[model samples]
Target: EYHIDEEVGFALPNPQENLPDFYNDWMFIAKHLPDLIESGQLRERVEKLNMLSIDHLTDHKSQRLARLVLGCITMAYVWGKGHGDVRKVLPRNIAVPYCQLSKKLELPPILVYADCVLANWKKKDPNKPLTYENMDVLFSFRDGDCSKGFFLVSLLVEIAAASAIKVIPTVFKAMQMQERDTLLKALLEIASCLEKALQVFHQIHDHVNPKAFFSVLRIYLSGWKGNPQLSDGLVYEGFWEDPKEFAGGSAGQSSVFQCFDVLLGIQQTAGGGHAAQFLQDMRRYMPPAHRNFLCSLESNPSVREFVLSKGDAGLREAYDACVKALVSLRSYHLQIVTKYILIPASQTGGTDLMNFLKTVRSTTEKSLLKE
Candidate 1:
């Protein structure tokens, strides 16, 4: 029942560029974020707009774009001036519709991976290929190209995994028919996809400078939760008296990786550590359809069960190969975090960022099928 295209995977098949005229103000403010902040007037600019109507948002496409625009605005309005001046509440003008659309889409009110990566990109030339060279972000927190690069690279990683996603259902069908050939074919193909996806992820360094990502862009991707700057979370004006807490945008929230873990039967929740819990919690940020896709896969017979049930040497090897590729993927991701998050060293809680990520990678290594 989930929509998985051969080309786009879980990213919006055709991302909408602009909302209806009723929301022109949002698109305008979202367009001029860098200028507004550059002048120290992003707050005044946001607070001036009236609560816009969501009536024009007839489909998921419109809602996604609207959420992207508003979520970017929300973060910028809160932290556009940097950490020294952070707002504890979001004004009703933006807060009302942000929460409305978030509730409608079943995503949190904050910008998640879905908002930043999945629905954030557009083709530079409609006729061109959808590679990083051909893509640019429709909206952004800063006018810098690095933000565009970061978003497009993340989008490419999603696109690179399209084949693996497309072949997922085939594995189940192959299992049902007891066709080992198709099963092995699907497993081997998935392994290759993981390898290719990791290669695509490595391209993040080409445009996104570590210093800029940490100082300029990373702040926009930050969430209200666990952030000491906003101790009680961000309050949504005219909606709730108390503040709200949600996780920031991160590749860890990608449904592509989550599906791989579930398909491989990787034990994510076995340990009650924060890494597993936070990783599990990240699923709520995915589009409902994508989240449901993961639930379906999780509930069904995992690849591990079917492989071990047959004791097929080829299947075990295929499964182990995929697990190895997955480990490499996580390890590389941890390395990027080291450069982007660790090296720049910002404020922190007591939790060890590198340790949680290593736990995720080490745990996946533990899932390799047999000796």
Candidate 2:
């Protein structure tokens, strides 16, 4: 089929006809990534479309387009502010349309914890219990299918690893004020989830090729400015900007853990240091719904009362386990650094990749609890 002409102006596919396959959809919409910001007319066209209802889509292409549209709007909000110390709020035009699309899509503005990791895993399981085997599949990308986008697959795996860290605040808040037995059971389950998430990362690391990944996919993964490669900075398709500027390497940033620090009575004598700042910066990457949900946790902080009251010994144990899980994740990153960065950097000219990985690692360290 031909590209949508200006006359068509964000035309909707006929519900009566069959929708295009996934690849066609991905390519067509993927091409628009740079266009969202590059062309105000395209952005305005998307903004004007009826984003609230996607039920008209009959196949994967429509679904993919819907996902891409949501991503485009999100990236424009976070990274469209231009380079250097950006902090622009989402205007009503984009913000309102974005929230509506997200609710319809059942995905966050940014694809991370729920949509990329949790939802994908749950769909394969009826009960969706957290298990080692289940988590392994969640991390696996159909055993590295290029048709599925190898770089894209690896990125999601990385996000899943970070997601283990992200879920803490949600779980802690959910456990508050429950019965003692219920709380203990919930804590144990959470521990299992964290353990499984870390295990999945290790499994993926074992099979992943550092050289190919860092040299090839790693470029696509990076988002910050000022690089030896791609002088203008990497503009991820769909995301439309350097991910580093929006949320730092797309996946392994530690906003999730930083939020956990506050919810569990961890102090930030100096405004919780960089971890707190990371939370504010990264929230822009999230859709308003997910962001608002996190903000709600900060305001109420059910875990704070539970921790301060010392009502249940198990609460402390559970919170400690969560912290331990985060440390394990950090340690896993060190191992990854050695294999994917340090060793590779010595062998070849991957200074750009090495430098980016080092920055991500240093930031990750700040997000974790000390001792």
Candidate 3:
């Protein structure tokens, strides 16, 4: 197919015909988008598109189709942001474009990998539903003759790269010095660390359970000196519903794996961080009295180690805390979602609805400081 022409806008594929096997085409273009962004062409094109105010009749079906395209664009941006990591050895100017390209390929991005896989599913026929194993796209890319790991590694690079972007700006502001070369070098190192983190997550993705992944990630990050709270939320959003599907054709049993992953990582990390606290908090999803009791214990901080290294009573106490904490966190997380993602997503009209969103956002942000 030819490149998108300026004189004509995006053309949709015919629904009557089977959608072409366009995954490779997307991958090829994505690989190069960073270069194009660096060259300044892609950004200009996007800017031009954004400037347009086209008027047309709104059809619900047509709008839904447009939303799907937006979803594709979202996936593109998600990965492109990550692939633009300095470690990719790309020029500075094109970072966003490169990330966009990788995302367009329909693979996962740094934190958005699981979501990316879901986006790639095509129903083939409108009547058919999404197949069950769609979640396994993460594992299949690595194992099934595809360089999935290589592609995903690109995302990890982006995270560190993006993080350095923040870290550099801070260092520059505080030190009153600007060293572009040094900053980029620092960013590159951070990107590498991020890559290691990516590998860790993938390892966790493969060997552990989603719940455990969620649990342990919360523990470690919450405690890490770094901005674990902010990053943990991002990681939480990235988990798949049934991550066991990614474990390379192993037994479908996801529960034991989830528990094992959380326990093992905790053993390795050796203490509860904010991530751990958050994980411990998330246990509230269970029931109340026991859950409330554990939430109280989390404030003690000394109990963190106890939860980490014992049996029977220790395990029971941990479980008790986990249930309470999980449920409490869930309530807070729901508030965040309602304000940040859900309420804003609703159409504007009712003042009460608007106030509800404001209330939730405020409540969640405040709740963050509590634990």
Candidate 4:
């Protein structure tokens, strides 16, 4: 939604996450990780990574590529087999440069939505477009398609979501101009945006095996904070003396849906409680400029305000259509949770899931005009 000019596309970095030739040492150590970890030599390789300096990472894109490389490396280091072996301290060479880059880039040191997906992709064939077959992860772990499928599905969803996001001003500006017909057309666009994204969402079933996602790849996405797996938190050795308790990678950290909710005024309920706070909490995990843009939207007028002020049936119906589109999107989101999380865990966190996403959908339903 922030790209209110030149027609927004996916929230991905343009020109993609390619780095300069200068950071060859960092990229070399990072990309070789799967083989190194398979030989149980990954940790040793990282230690001897010679405390490489990020002085050559003077630009934005390369810095993020650095972050993405370290993100995969860090997660692999901690949970390569944290199934039984627990690593307490992330080594000095890895932790030092990684932590500094996080501060420089305004991100947490852990692997996040930005690192894992937004910056993790490249087109296998540049001319093929970013569909499932043409995409690849920049630095894949040993997991192969499980890693490829998981991230590609997410990348494709972001690509599809770009279609919807590119129209923020098309909807909002039309509302401000009081052009009823134009506004209605714009609302229709918002209405269909996520529904189309859900079409891309369906590809997940054909992509990654749900059980494999929950078992193998999901562990790397786990964080130190609020997790029993690392109850005391992980120490970023040689950086901070205190063990860092950072949040892990999550789709909620993405900005598009938050922009959708802001545009449509889908209020999350439970008023100042943990449930509501989490939506705002996830914003802290966003790229700083994106979150700042969200704050700007909250400061401005919304389509929901314009729709609610009028009594026109056509306007309300158009407004409701947008809300309903978002509702279906949320429903598909819940469906993915059930398939990917619940069924994989054999219904372990099903109730916990219900309390959160159920209320999210209910609030979406509650946003209708007459109510």
Model 3 clash count equals: 30
Candidate 1: what lDDT?
0.85
TM-score of each: 0.96, 0.52, 0.23, 0.93
Candidate 1 is scored at a TM of 0.96
RMSD (Cα, Å) of model 4: 2.2
* lDDT (CA) per prediction: 0.85, 0.44, 0.28, 0.77
How does model 4 score by TM-score? 0.93
Clashing pairs in 4: none
Minimal lDDT window, size 10, model 4: 1-10
Q: If both were scored by lDDT, which would come out higher, candidate 2 or candidate 4?
A: 4
TM-score-based ranking, best first? 1, 4, 2, 3
**Regions of candidate 3 where Cα sits further than 4 Å from its true position:** 1-35, 51-111, 121-272, 277-371
Per-residue lDDT over 299-329 for candidate 2, one digit per residue giving the tens place of the 0 to 100 score:
6645645644665566667766765665566
lDDT of 4 by residue, 188-222 (tens): 77678767887888888898888778887787787
The CA-based lDDT of model 2 is what?
0.44
Better of 3 and 4 by lDDT: 4
Question: Model 2: runs farther than 4 Å from truth?
Answer: 1-178, 224-249, 253-275, 302-305, 348-371
Best candidate per lDDT, number?
Answer: 1
Number of colliding residue pairs in each model: 0, 4, 30, 0
Clashing pairs in 1: none
